[PDB]
Structure 1
Amino acid sequence: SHRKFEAPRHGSLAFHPRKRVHKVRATVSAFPKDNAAEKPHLTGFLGFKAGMTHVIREVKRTNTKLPKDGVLEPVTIIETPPMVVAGFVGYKKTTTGLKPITAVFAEHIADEFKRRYTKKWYKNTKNQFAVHTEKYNDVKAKSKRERQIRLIKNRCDVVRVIAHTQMALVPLKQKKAEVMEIQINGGSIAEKVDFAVSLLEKQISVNSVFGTDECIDVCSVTKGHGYNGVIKRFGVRHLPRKTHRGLRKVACVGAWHPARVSWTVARAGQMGFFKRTEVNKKIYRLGCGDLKNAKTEFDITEKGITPMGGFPHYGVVKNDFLMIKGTVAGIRRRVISLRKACFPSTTRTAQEQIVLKFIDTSSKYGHSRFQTTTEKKARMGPMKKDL
């Protein structure tokens, strides 16, 4: 027969099967379409999420009914210390997709990049990139490098730089660096390589990749929830109280005669450590140089972005950071792969200037009141301690 009353199906079929990922970092599966009539530029970065905080933003839009005072909005603080470029790789378009032709590597490789090639460093002889470094200047092994460059300029269409983070500047306990291939989009392949070769061993900062008021496509791996039922995972209706053998489940898992459970039926499984790529994430503040603090024109108290007591479970943010708009996929300390948007937005919101009237730096535990610990002591006065 026909279902008595029609309803929207629960859950999404574009994500089935729901297989949890293995590597914590989420590989970006596509880069913005190459434009051949501009100066070569990096199209991505890699930052570690720290937490969230709320801001009061002045509205700079036209023909809107939002209050002139401000709009309270949530932001996300993604700490991005500068990365180090450690080579580049040239791809070629064949009848079976891209095919990595060669890969040129720099001379001096940090110990945070060598660790990625081993599974037990404390017992490993740590001889990675040793023969490559020791014979770097030899004439035989210098012509090979010059040969690789001429191969890429002739038989390649895509050039990417193998950039890795620096793990000594983040409060994470991890030591090995996270490696990302950031494509270069710009002029012809002759000048892409000349740009890629110019970047070797040279740190790249986020302001050289992104710009102010730029929307980005963050790609990351969501929170881990483990085995979960049908009510949490898909969202089906919980059965009445009278039910025998329990309530929180799907009742009918298929009609009789197909004689098989469909792939579309809501089933128990593992919701959790998935990979999701959101789009159109507006950047509010670019914490580079002058804007590395949390002060504004309206509120001129000199305070760092770290709330009183530090970001929970994370620590203290002291290096370059972003201010994404809203919630990005993944809990604190996750490795977030930012990316320049593949489909740039033309809405009047995406073209709006971001003017911030206030950024909350009060503590994130309990119902905290003060903003800086140098103003809690002034309002509360002298305690019995220290007196």
Structure 2
Amino acid sequence: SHRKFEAPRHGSLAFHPRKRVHKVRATVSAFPKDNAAEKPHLTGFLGFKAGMTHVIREVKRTNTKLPKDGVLEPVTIIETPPMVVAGFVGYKKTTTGLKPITAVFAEHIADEFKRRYTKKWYKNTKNQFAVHTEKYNDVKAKSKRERQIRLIKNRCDVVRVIAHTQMALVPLKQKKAEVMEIQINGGSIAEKVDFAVSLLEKQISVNSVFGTDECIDVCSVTKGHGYNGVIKRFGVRHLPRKTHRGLRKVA
């Protein structure tokens, strides 16, 4: 029979299944749609949450009844030391999605970046990018690099720069860097690669990526809780006190 009284379902079906992620860093599923009528610029960054505090801000909107002395609001602090750009990769649009064509890296790579490619650094020989760095200035290897640049300019649509953090500037005990690919939105692929090539080995500060009073999107992994019952996970009604075998479950 029909349920006697109607009520919205508890929990969203848009977040099913509720599977916990495996990596602390969260990868953005998308980037803002590219426009070819502007200078190349980065469309993302990466920072560490420090905490939260509160501020009093002066209301500038007109036709509002808010107090003239300020409004109390919360603010989250995100410490964002400069990143180091250590390469770039070109993506091509095929009939099965973007496909990375080639990746070009810089001559000098920090050990923070190298730590990503091992699982026991203290036992590894730490020979990451050794052949790439040692033969960087060879005549044969240089010619290969020029082809990679020209291949991207010919058969690629999306250019992203592989930037990594400097964990020595934050109070975290972690020493391995955090790597993020930041898409370049702007001019044609000719001037996109030129911009990416200019940024090799350099440092990108967050002021160059974001403006002032700019609304941004944030992707991160929430706070873990472990095994949880129905009441906390979804928000069902607790059963009456008289119930045999327990109260905090779906009848």
Under TM normalisation by the shorter chain, which class is it? over 0.9
1:147-196 deviation per Cα after TM superposition (whole angstroms, max 9, x unaligned): 00000000000000000000000000000000000000000000000000
Distance 2:183 2:249 in 1: 57
- Tell me how far 1:224 sits from its aligned partner: 0.4
TM-score w.r.t. structure 1 length?
0.63
Write the distance in 2 (CA, Å) between the matches of 1:96 and 1:45. 27
Unaligned runs of 5+ in 2: none
Secondary structure at the residue paired with 2:232?
helix
Cα pair distance change 1:3/1:154, threshold 3 Å: same
Please give the alpha-carbon distance, in whole angstroms, between the structure 1 residues aligned to 2:62 and 2:39.
34
For residue 384 of structure 1, report the CA deviation from its aligned partner. 55
SS at match of 2:169: coil
Cα distance, 1:238–1:183 mapped onto 2, change above 3 Å: same
Identity across matched positions, percent:
98
1:56 & 1:104 partners in 2: Cα distance? 47
Provide, for residues 119-173 of structure 1, a one-character-per-residue CA deviation record: whole Å limited to 9, x for no partner.
Answer: 0000000000000000000000000000000000000000000000000000000
Confirm or deny: 8 A CA contact 2:238 2:249 kept in the other structure: no
Q: Alpha-carbon deviation of 1:3? A: 0.3
Shift of 1:235: 0.2
Aligned residues: 251
Q: Distance in 1 between matches of 2:50 and 2:134?
A: 39
Counterpart position of 1:56: 56
Query: Partners in 1 of 2:96 and 2:227 — Cα distance?
Result: 38
Displacement of 1:206 in angstroms is 0.2
Aligned position for 2:119: 119
Secondary structure, counterpart of 1:81 in structure 2: coil
Q: State how far apart, in whole Å, the 1-side matches of 2:86 and 2:146 are.
A: 17
**Any gaps of 5 or more consecutive residues in structure 1?**
247-382
Higher percent of residues as helix: 2
Deviations 1:222-274 (A, max 9, x none): 0000000000000000000000000xxxxxxxxxxxxxxxxxxxxxxxxxxxx
The whole-number CA distance in structure 2 between the counterparts of 1:207 and 1:54 is 22
Moved over 4 A (4+): 383-387
Contact 2:229/2:248 (<8 A) preserved: no
User: TM-score, structure 2 length as denominator?
Assistant: 0.98
In 2: Cα distance, 1:386 partner to 1:168 partner: 49
Q: How does 1:364-383 map to 2 (within 5 A)?
A: none
Structure-1 separation of matches of 2:145 and 2:138: 11
Per-residue Cα deviation, 1:271-295 (whole angstroms, up to 9, x for no partner): xxxxxxxxxxxxxxxxxxxxxxxxx
Cα separation, 1, equivalents of 2:248 and 2:13: 62
Give the RMSD, CA atoms, in angstroms. 8.1
Q: Deviations over 1:198-232 (max 9, x none)?
A: 00000000000000000000000000000000000
